Amino acid sequence: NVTTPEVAFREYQTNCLASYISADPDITPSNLILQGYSGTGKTYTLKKYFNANPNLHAVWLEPVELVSWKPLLQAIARTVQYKLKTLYPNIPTTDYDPLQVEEPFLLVKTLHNIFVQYESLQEKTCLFLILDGFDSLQDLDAALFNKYIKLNELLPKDSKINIKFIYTMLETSFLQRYSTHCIPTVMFPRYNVDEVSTILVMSRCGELMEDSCLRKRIIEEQITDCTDDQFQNVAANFIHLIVQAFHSYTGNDIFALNDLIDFKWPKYVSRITKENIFEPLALYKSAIKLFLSTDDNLSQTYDLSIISKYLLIASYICSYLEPRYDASIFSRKNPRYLQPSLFAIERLLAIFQAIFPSLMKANIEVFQNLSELHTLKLIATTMNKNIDYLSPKVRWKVNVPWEIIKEISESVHFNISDYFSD
Amino acid sequence: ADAQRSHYTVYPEKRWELYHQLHSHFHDQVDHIIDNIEADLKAEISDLLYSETTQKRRCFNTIFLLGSDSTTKIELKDESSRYNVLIELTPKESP
Amino acid sequence: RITIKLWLKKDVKNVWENLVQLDFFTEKSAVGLRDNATAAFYASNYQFQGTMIPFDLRSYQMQIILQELRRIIPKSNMYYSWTQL
Amino acid sequence: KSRHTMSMAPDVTREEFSLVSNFFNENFQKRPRQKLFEIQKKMFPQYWFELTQGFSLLFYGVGSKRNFLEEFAIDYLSPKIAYSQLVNSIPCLILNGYNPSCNYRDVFKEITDLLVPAELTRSETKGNHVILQIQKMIDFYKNQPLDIKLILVVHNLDGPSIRKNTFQTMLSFLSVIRQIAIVASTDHIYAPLLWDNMKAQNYNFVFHDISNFEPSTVESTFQDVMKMGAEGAKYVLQSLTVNSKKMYKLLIETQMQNRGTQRTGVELKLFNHLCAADFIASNEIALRSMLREFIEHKMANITKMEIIWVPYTYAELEKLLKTVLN
DNA sequence: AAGGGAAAATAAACAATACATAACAAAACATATAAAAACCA
Ligand SMILES: Nc1ncnc2c1ncn2[C@@H]1O[C@H](COP(=O)(O)OP(=O)(O)OP(O)(O)=S)[C@@H](O)[C@H]1O
């Protein structure tokens, strides 16, 4: 028995989370998997349960604001004695150091020290720990996730307070590594095109009718006393069209819709009239220009000098020109798609001396622009970035695509498409 | 004798004066121009770092300093009842 | 053979981002999860070469093969002629 | 592929090489060498004058410059500048770049102690604070009276440790300071690959040629070629038991009966019987145990008959015959 | 002007070498505490 909440599209999943969670510890299963990709509101639908259940007690941890397991143990032990202070303030406490723990023994060593002074409680109370984002921990491995499963059983089972877990993770290839533990899973499905728009309208009406960019445009135009419902319609006409002209570009996201709205909204506001408030279809026909462009990209003619420009134009030549062909076709007498090959030194100046307008011999400034180009990360080393100077075995390679080469060819009037021949 | 040990220290004009009155006088014009762009770069970051009150107020402000030489130093306002600190991250310190 | 918006280059990347983190593709030589801690810590210090080639040339391989797509994609969709070669 | 090889060369021992090498490098072109050294001596006042402008002076050229730098830095310049400012003369801190054991921490720990410890700079010593500690050194030095207090020398700037990139940028920030004069030399043909327009902005390098075609005595020591195994196991046989000489002599005969490759080798069974024939090998174990000593110092090989063969050349084994075995 | 014919190019099988990364070692960088050792007093 529990007081379930109600939400928009989790009607099955609210039932199971009301099923798999009770305030009684015996009915409560130990470990749990909430799985789904980002863009399902699992952090939404979990907390939305918890606000409707003030009877239980939740301790909220956040792995994504941590970096490793060694603070993650320090994250747990600092918080439970922080929470149990605010739940039973009459109970005296030998407060321990949460900085002291760094190893997975030390947690259950300290939880053996924490819970024993809390033994005098009246009934078996549970205590739900919540980890949010267990796959995106940036030092994860295989033998961390099971390491947190068996933590319950190393605890004494007869204590008045029982710690149980709920794990939030993503990337369901990861969950397939641990199906043999058979812990109860509640998968969260992705969304469909209507329920994306249905979620988005009931979540963004509260800001886009109350933004001052509307409220300025209210008093700036001749304001007819349009209702909030009249503000609701144009907001709804905005949302029901923006998901229609962009759904193929964004997929079934919610986060990627929550910001593209907040980029194209004031540019939509300026192109309204006093009269198009009653005229929605012609309003889209006047504000058309934003609905067919992305506007997420905030093609350079590159800063580098002339001899460095020809230094780049010789380096792109060994993306296709092998040593078997080059010395014949460049006498002094297609892999456009493919990944670039590997240079060595002085093959550059082999090609550089050929393609330059006897007119040049001094190569001090030519050697200057090489490590200038190395700091630009346009030509990088194959090996580590340390010993590449003294000629040991060091291979070089470009990192510029074909188009920026093509503009920079014509920027110095040099022709390159002749020498690329499939 | 000792050259295989590394880094051993040891403790062992009528015309030119007319250069000397010219050289430094020129160099006073140099470095005074150098602090001008130094005051220029320090100014245009400082006003633009502040006074930008966005409405969402859940976003960091980013600044792209295009064409910059990776050595551009910055000073900050005092702006009391709040500490304002500077952190620099080298790519050498980015493992 | 017939009105379909062909998209640009600068936008497919935003769709290409979700496809690799939907695990429909993999990187070519990427050991995914190390077994224990000190083998993973030995992979963290190692600076990589695949990031040093740009985004559009990381040699992505396949998770779901072409022939199996014909069995799941219904014939009502217009691209059903493209499942088979 | 009939190639003449360095193994097929009349080789030269240790004392024979270095002595006749010392004869050439001190008597080959002696008269024109100091004749060059007197010609370039008149450039020495020109270097003194430009170096007051804080110019990082860099010397390129063929041949070793190590002797020339130490004459120019120590004897000529360092007391000349102390006399021209008005007491111990200006401290010279050389950096042997050909010595690979140069680090960035140790030489800079010398530098801040060579430079003035006017403040508690150990407070800013904290975790890489080296660029941090030198930055606090720079801005203070912008508002000091302009005089050189230190001249540093960096021999062989393309050396095996100095050419590392985190060390190179460390020297770059030193050179912008007006109080120190930076007189260095390199030898590489790709030395201007080391610097971009960022570092040379901090450096303001100028260049001068010095080509005296010196032999690089000190700079040859750390370097090695196959002069510096056929020569390795040439010394172990000179200190062993007397029986190992005989069982290697019987080894080397039938292994040269047929370059010294695999095919001239011998089977283990008959070689046991052969070294049983001259009352030498008792059995397989007593043979193999004093054959593992030839194995442990990599003096013989085995591939598959059960062929043990010596990895030295045809010419080498008869040299091992007539000299050390006999 | 024709033409021979050797240089250059192509292809394919095979061998030899280089490369990216995994696994690890070791040195620099960092902290902690009981025992020695100065050291006032
Ligand atoms: N039924 C719903 N009713 C209202 N809003 C919803 C509903 N489902 C999802 N949302 C919204 O979807 C947003 C997505 O929140 P998140 O929980 O971060 O998404 P996510 O899939 O959990 O990605 P994360 O944070 O990486 S786990 C929430 O902030 C809600 O505003």
PDB file of N, CA and C in Angstrom, chain B residues 1-13 16 19-20 23 27 69-71 73 88 90 92-93, chain D residues 48-49 53 66 74 78 88-96 98-99 101-102 106-107 110 166 198 218 221:
ATOM      1  N   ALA B   1      87.239  17.630 -18.758  1.00  0.00           N
ATOM      2  CA  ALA B   1      87.406  16.848 -17.543  1.00  0.00           C
ATOM      3  C   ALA B   1      86.064  16.646 -16.864  1.00  0.00           C
ATOM      4  N   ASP B   2      85.348  17.751 -16.670  1.00  0.00           N
ATOM      5  CA  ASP B   2      84.070  17.713 -15.970  1.00  0.00           C
ATOM      6  C   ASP B   2      82.883  17.757 -16.924  1.00  0.00           C
ATOM      7  N   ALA B   3      83.138  17.883 -18.231  1.00  0.00           N
ATOM      8  CA  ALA B   3      82.100  18.169 -19.220  1.00  0.00           C
ATOM      9  C   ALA B   3      81.044  17.079 -19.345  1.00  0.00           C
ATOM     10  N   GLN B   4      81.303  15.884 -18.827  1.00  0.00           N
ATOM     11  CA  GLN B   4      80.260  14.874 -18.789  1.00  0.00           C
ATOM     12  C   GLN B   4      79.298  15.069 -17.622  1.00  0.00           C
ATOM     13  N   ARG B   5      79.693  15.781 -16.569  1.00  0.00           N
ATOM     14  CA  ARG B   5      78.703  16.257 -15.617  1.00  0.00           C
ATOM     15  C   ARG B   5      77.919  17.412 -16.228  1.00  0.00           C
ATOM     16  N   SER B   6      76.597  17.350 -16.096  1.00  0.00           N
ATOM     17  CA  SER B   6      75.721  18.352 -16.691  1.00  0.00           C
ATOM     18  C   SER B   6      75.552  19.547 -15.754  1.00  0.00           C
ATOM     19  N   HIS B   7      75.521  20.739 -16.354  1.00  0.00           N
ATOM     20  CA  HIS B   7      75.256  22.053 -15.740  1.00  0.00           C
ATOM     21  C   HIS B   7      76.074  22.336 -14.480  1.00  0.00           C
ATOM     22  N   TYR B   8      77.394  22.301 -14.624  1.00  0.00           N
ATOM     23  CA  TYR B   8      78.235  22.774 -13.536  1.00  0.00           C
ATOM     24  C   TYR B   8      78.528  24.259 -13.696  1.00  0.00           C
ATOM     25  N   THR B   9      78.051  25.062 -12.751  1.00  0.00           N
ATOM     26  CA  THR B   9      78.336  26.486 -12.781  1.00  0.00           C
ATOM     27  C   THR B   9      79.777  26.760 -12.369  1.00  0.00           C
ATOM     28  N   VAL B  10      80.232  27.976 -12.660  1.00  0.00           N
ATOM     29  CA  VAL B  10      81.575  28.421 -12.312  1.00  0.00           C
ATOM     30  C   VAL B  10      81.556  29.942 -12.231  1.00  0.00           C
ATOM     31  N   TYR B  11      82.484  30.507 -11.456  1.00  0.00           N
ATOM     32  CA  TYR B  11      82.581  31.947 -11.225  1.00  0.00           C
ATOM     33  C   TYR B  11      83.991  32.383 -11.605  1.00  0.00           C
ATOM     34  N   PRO B  12      84.248  32.655 -12.895  1.00  0.00           N
ATOM     35  CA  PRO B  12      85.593  33.002 -13.367  1.00  0.00           C
ATOM     36  C   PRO B  12      86.068  34.384 -12.931  1.00  0.00           C
ATOM     37  N   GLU B  13      85.039  55.517 -27.031  1.00  0.00           N
ATOM     38  CA  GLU B  13      83.645  55.227 -27.332  1.00  0.00           C
ATOM     39  C   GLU B  13      82.897  56.530 -27.587  1.00  0.00           C
ATOM     40  N   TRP B  16      79.661  55.370 -29.615  1.00  0.00           N
ATOM     41  CA  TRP B  16      78.610  54.522 -29.051  1.00  0.00           C
ATOM     42  C   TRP B  16      77.694  55.285 -28.104  1.00  0.00           C
ATOM     43  N   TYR B  19      74.761  56.605 -29.911  1.00  0.00           N
ATOM     44  CA  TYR B  19      73.747  55.573 -30.059  1.00  0.00           C
ATOM     45  C   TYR B  19      72.885  55.500 -28.813  1.00  0.00           C
ATOM     46  N   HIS B  20      73.514  55.674 -27.652  1.00  0.00           N
ATOM     47  CA  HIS B  20      72.853  55.409 -26.382  1.00  0.00           C
ATOM     48  C   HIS B  20      71.774  56.442 -26.100  1.00  0.00           C
ATOM     49  N   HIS B  23      68.804  55.092 -28.645  1.00  0.00           N
ATOM     50  CA  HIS B  23      68.205  53.767 -28.578  1.00  0.00           C
ATOM     51  C   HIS B  23      67.084  53.710 -27.560  1.00  0.00           C
ATOM     52  N   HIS B  27      63.005  53.297 -27.490  1.00  0.00           N
ATOM     53  CA  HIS B  27      62.347  52.216 -26.770  1.00  0.00           C
ATOM     54  C   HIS B  27      61.316  52.719 -25.775  1.00  0.00           C
ATOM     55  N   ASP B  69      46.950  34.783 -28.986  1.00  0.00           N
ATOM     56  CA  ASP B  69      48.274  34.183 -29.036  1.00  0.00           C
ATOM     57  C   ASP B  69      48.538  33.166 -27.936  1.00  0.00           C
ATOM     58  N   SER B  70      47.501  32.690 -27.243  1.00  0.00           N
ATOM     59  CA  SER B  70      47.553  31.760 -26.112  1.00  0.00           C
ATOM     60  C   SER B  70      48.348  32.278 -24.916  1.00  0.00           C
ATOM     61  N   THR B  71      48.673  33.570 -24.857  1.00  0.00           N
ATOM     62  CA  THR B  71      49.418  34.172 -23.758  1.00  0.00           C
ATOM     63  C   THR B  71      48.724  35.385 -23.172  1.00  0.00           C
ATOM     64  N   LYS B  73      47.080  37.664 -20.914  1.00  0.00           N
ATOM     65  CA  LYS B  73      46.776  37.682 -19.494  1.00  0.00           C
ATOM     66  C   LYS B  73      45.557  38.560 -19.227  1.00  0.00           C
ATOM     67  N   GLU B  88      43.670  28.650 -14.743  1.00  0.00           N
ATOM     68  CA  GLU B  88      44.237  28.435 -16.062  1.00  0.00           C
ATOM     69  C   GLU B  88      44.526  26.954 -16.220  1.00  0.00           C
ATOM     70  N   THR B  90      46.389  24.403 -18.710  1.00  0.00           N
ATOM     71  CA  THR B  90      47.249  24.161 -19.846  1.00  0.00           C
ATOM     72  C   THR B  90      46.872  22.844 -20.510  1.00  0.00           C
ATOM     73  N   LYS B  92      49.137  20.851 -21.344  1.00  0.00           N
ATOM     74  CA  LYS B  92      50.029  19.991 -20.582  1.00  0.00           C
ATOM     75  C   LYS B  92      49.350  19.483 -19.315  1.00  0.00           C
ATOM     76  N   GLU B  93      48.461  20.279 -18.734  1.00  0.00           N
ATOM     77  CA  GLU B  93      47.685  19.789 -17.606  1.00  0.00           C
ATOM     78  C   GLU B  93      46.310  19.301 -18.023  1.00  0.00           C
TER      79      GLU B  93
ATOM     80  N   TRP D  48      79.783  41.353 -27.890  1.00  0.00           N
ATOM     81  CA  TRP D  48      79.626  42.021 -26.600  1.00  0.00           C
ATOM     82  C   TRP D  48      78.621  43.157 -26.689  1.00  0.00           C
ATOM     83  N   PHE D  49      78.639  43.875 -27.807  1.00  0.00           N
ATOM     84  CA  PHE D  49      77.780  45.038 -27.960  1.00  0.00           C
ATOM     85  C   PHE D  49      76.331  44.641 -28.192  1.00  0.00           C
ATOM     86  N   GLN D  53      71.705  44.178 -25.676  1.00  0.00           N
ATOM     87  CA  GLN D  53      70.324  44.358 -26.093  1.00  0.00           C
ATOM     88  C   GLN D  53      69.463  43.152 -25.752  1.00  0.00           C
ATOM     89  N   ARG D  66      81.987  23.283 -28.994  1.00  0.00           N
ATOM     90  CA  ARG D  66      82.029  23.231 -27.536  1.00  0.00           C
ATOM     91  C   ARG D  66      83.243  23.944 -26.961  1.00  0.00           C
ATOM     92  N   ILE D  74      83.602  32.091 -21.031  1.00  0.00           N
ATOM     93  CA  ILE D  74      84.285  32.164 -19.744  1.00  0.00           C
ATOM     94  C   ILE D  74      85.352  33.245 -19.758  1.00  0.00           C
ATOM     95  N   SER D  78      82.613  37.162 -19.785  1.00  0.00           N
ATOM     96  CA  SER D  78      82.223  37.255 -18.379  1.00  0.00           C
ATOM     97  C   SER D  78      83.066  38.157 -17.468  1.00  0.00           C
ATOM     98  N   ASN D  88      83.277  39.616  -7.361  1.00  0.00           N
ATOM     99  CA  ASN D  88      83.332  38.430  -8.205  1.00  0.00           C
ATOM    100  C   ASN D  88      82.635  38.715  -9.527  1.00  0.00           C
ATOM    101  N   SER D  89      83.164  38.155 -10.613  1.00  0.00           N
ATOM    102  CA  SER D  89      82.599  38.396 -11.932  1.00  0.00           C
ATOM    103  C   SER D  89      81.302  37.623 -12.128  1.00  0.00           C
ATOM    104  N   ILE D  90      80.721  37.774 -13.312  1.00  0.00           N
ATOM    105  CA  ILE D  90      79.384  37.287 -13.645  1.00  0.00           C
ATOM    106  C   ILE D  90      79.332  35.765 -13.620  1.00  0.00           C
ATOM    107  N   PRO D  91      78.381  35.168 -12.899  1.00  0.00           N
ATOM    108  CA  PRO D  91      78.306  33.704 -12.830  1.00  0.00           C
ATOM    109  C   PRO D  91      77.906  33.057 -14.142  1.00  0.00           C
ATOM    110  N   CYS D  92      78.672  32.052 -14.549  1.00  0.00           N
ATOM    111  CA  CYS D  92      78.406  31.321 -15.780  1.00  0.00           C
ATOM    112  C   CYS D  92      77.719  30.012 -15.428  1.00  0.00           C
ATOM    113  N   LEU D  93      76.532  29.790 -15.978  1.00  0.00           N
ATOM    114  CA  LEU D  93      75.838  28.520 -15.799  1.00  0.00           C
ATOM    115  C   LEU D  93      75.735  27.846 -17.156  1.00  0.00           C
ATOM    116  N   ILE D  94      76.604  26.888 -17.404  1.00  0.00           N
ATOM    117  CA  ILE D  94      76.532  26.112 -18.630  1.00  0.00           C
ATOM    118  C   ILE D  94      75.424  25.086 -18.478  1.00  0.00           C
ATOM    119  N   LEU D  95      74.967  24.545 -19.597  1.00  0.00           N
ATOM    120  CA  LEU D  95      74.026  23.432 -19.643  1.00  0.00           C
ATOM    121  C   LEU D  95      74.543  22.451 -20.683  1.00  0.00           C
ATOM    122  N   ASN D  96      74.992  21.286 -20.238  1.00  0.00           N
ATOM    123  CA  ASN D  96      75.481  20.311 -21.197  1.00  0.00           C
ATOM    124  C   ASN D  96      74.319  19.562 -21.821  1.00  0.00           C
ATOM    125  N   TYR D  98      74.360  17.716 -24.488  1.00  0.00           N
ATOM    126  CA  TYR D  98      74.721  16.382 -24.937  1.00  0.00           C
ATOM    127  C   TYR D  98      74.621  15.366 -23.814  1.00  0.00           C
ATOM    128  N   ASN D  99      74.685  15.813 -22.574  1.00  0.00           N
ATOM    129  CA  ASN D  99      74.389  14.987 -21.417  1.00  0.00           C
ATOM    130  C   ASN D  99      72.882  14.786 -21.360  1.00  0.00           C
ATOM    131  N   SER D 101      70.983  13.571 -19.126  1.00  0.00           N
ATOM    132  CA  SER D 101      70.384  13.562 -17.804  1.00  0.00           C
ATOM    133  C   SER D 101      69.941  14.940 -17.338  1.00  0.00           C
ATOM    134  N   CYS D 102      69.657  15.860 -18.253  1.00  0.00           N
ATOM    135  CA  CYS D 102      69.159  17.168 -17.856  1.00  0.00           C
ATOM    136  C   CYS D 102      67.640  17.139 -17.757  1.00  0.00           C
ATOM    137  N   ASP D 106      65.512  20.264 -12.002  1.00  0.00           N
ATOM    138  CA  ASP D 106      66.798  20.415 -11.334  1.00  0.00           C
ATOM    139  C   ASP D 106      67.533  21.664 -11.800  1.00  0.00           C
ATOM    140  N   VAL D 107      67.489  21.946 -13.103  1.00  0.00           N
ATOM    141  CA  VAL D 107      68.232  23.084 -13.624  1.00  0.00           C
ATOM    142  C   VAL D 107      67.543  24.387 -13.248  1.00  0.00           C
ATOM    143  N   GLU D 110      68.372  25.255  -9.751  1.00  0.00           N
ATOM    144  CA  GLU D 110      69.624  25.999  -9.740  1.00  0.00           C
ATOM    145  C   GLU D 110      69.393  27.457 -10.109  1.00  0.00           C
ATOM    146  N   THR D 166      58.512  20.251 -23.325  1.00  0.00           N
ATOM    147  CA  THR D 166      58.209  20.965 -22.090  1.00  0.00           C
ATOM    148  C   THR D 166      59.446  21.654 -21.536  1.00  0.00           C
ATOM    149  N   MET D 198      55.775  31.884 -31.987  1.00  0.00           N
ATOM    150  CA  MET D 198      55.507  32.175 -30.588  1.00  0.00           C
ATOM    151  C   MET D 198      56.796  32.202 -29.786  1.00  0.00           C
ATOM    152  N   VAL D 218      84.171  15.083 -26.574  1.00  0.00           N
ATOM    153  CA  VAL D 218      83.253  14.787 -25.477  1.00  0.00           C
ATOM    154  C   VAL D 218      81.912  14.320 -26.028  1.00  0.00           C
ATOM    155  N   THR D 221      81.375  10.515 -26.856  1.00  0.00           N
ATOM    156  CA  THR D 221      81.455   9.534 -25.781  1.00  0.00           C
ATOM    157  C   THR D 221      80.116   8.854 -25.525  1.00  0.00           C
TER     158      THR D 221
END
